[PDB]
């Protein structure tokens, strides 16, 4: 029925998100200007770098995350980073015109802008479909932050060491989510809600997979890799 601890976990994650997601998008002004070949890469690279920083800050506040080894923490962030960014970006995504609207026209990204970052439809289409499907769930902010935390602490991540501990931490987050839906999400919106959210995590592994291929191809050419940031290169691989 949602113990005090489970409510505690949610309150912690909500605050962690509030401290790492600025809906005013004021910081975007510090990024290299968006330009509409690969004219949007400098801007989106900066956007992503900033986002990596915010996802890291969010992750450190995940109850239990701090108990993992420095190595495990590193492994989880490198593997989930792109996934959590895609996930958190749903907050700026708008089905009005299938674009990521971050406060203004300059900061409103659509399919062509992503295309101008070096990506193809093989990633973009399923990415928009994902955003569309996630939006369709109309998740409570509570469910949104729990999903990002669950995504981060995944036991099957490649290179994971203490998988047992990682699984234990995630399980506590999963049980928190499952119970929240049952007790706080009214039907019909709660119908199969948990399974649907886990399915989104499966979609993200696929998206992660495709993004990594296009990123390696894109970052294989020095001139492109030259337009990224130091953090992006370190986290997404060099």
């Amino acid at each position: 029925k949602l113990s005090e601890e489970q409510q505690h976990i949610i309150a912690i994650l909500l605050d962690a998100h509030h401290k790492t997601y600025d809906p005013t998008y004021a910081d975007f002004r510090d990024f290299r200007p968006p330009v509409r070949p690969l004219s949007m890469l400098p801007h989106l690279a900066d956007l992503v770098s900033y986002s990596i920083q915010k996802v890291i800050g969010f992750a450190k506040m995940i109850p239990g995350f701090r108990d993992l080894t420095s190595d495990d923490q590193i492994v989880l962030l490198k593997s989930s980073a792109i996934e959590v960014i895609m996930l958190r970006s749903n907050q700026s995504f708008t089905m009005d015109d299938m674009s990521w609207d971050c406060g203004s026209q300059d900061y409103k990204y659509d399919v062509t802008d992503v295309s101008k970052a070096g990506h193809t439809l093989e990633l973009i289409e399923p990415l928009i479909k994902f955003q569309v499907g996630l939006k369709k769930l109309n998740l409570h902010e509570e469910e949104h932050v729990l999903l990002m935390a669950i995504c981060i602490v995944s036991p099957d991540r490649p290179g994971v060491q203490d998988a047992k501990l990682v699984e234990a931490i995630q399980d506590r987050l999963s049980n928190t989510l499952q119970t929240y839906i049952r007790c706080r999400h009214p039907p019909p919106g709660s119908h199969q809600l948990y399974a649907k959210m886990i399915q989104k995590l499966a979609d993200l592994r696929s998206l992660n997979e495709e993004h990594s291929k296009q990123y390696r191809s894109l970052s294989f050419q020095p001139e492109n890799s030259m337009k990224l940031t130091p953090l992006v290169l370190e986290v997404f691989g060099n």
Binding site: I56, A59, S70, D71, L77, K78, P230, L231, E234, V235
Partner: peptide, 11 residues
């Protein structure tokens, strides 16, 4: 395994 910036942000 040698992720300076990422490690610093996690400390």
């Amino acid at each position: 395994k040698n992720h300076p910036m990422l490690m610093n942000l996690l400390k």
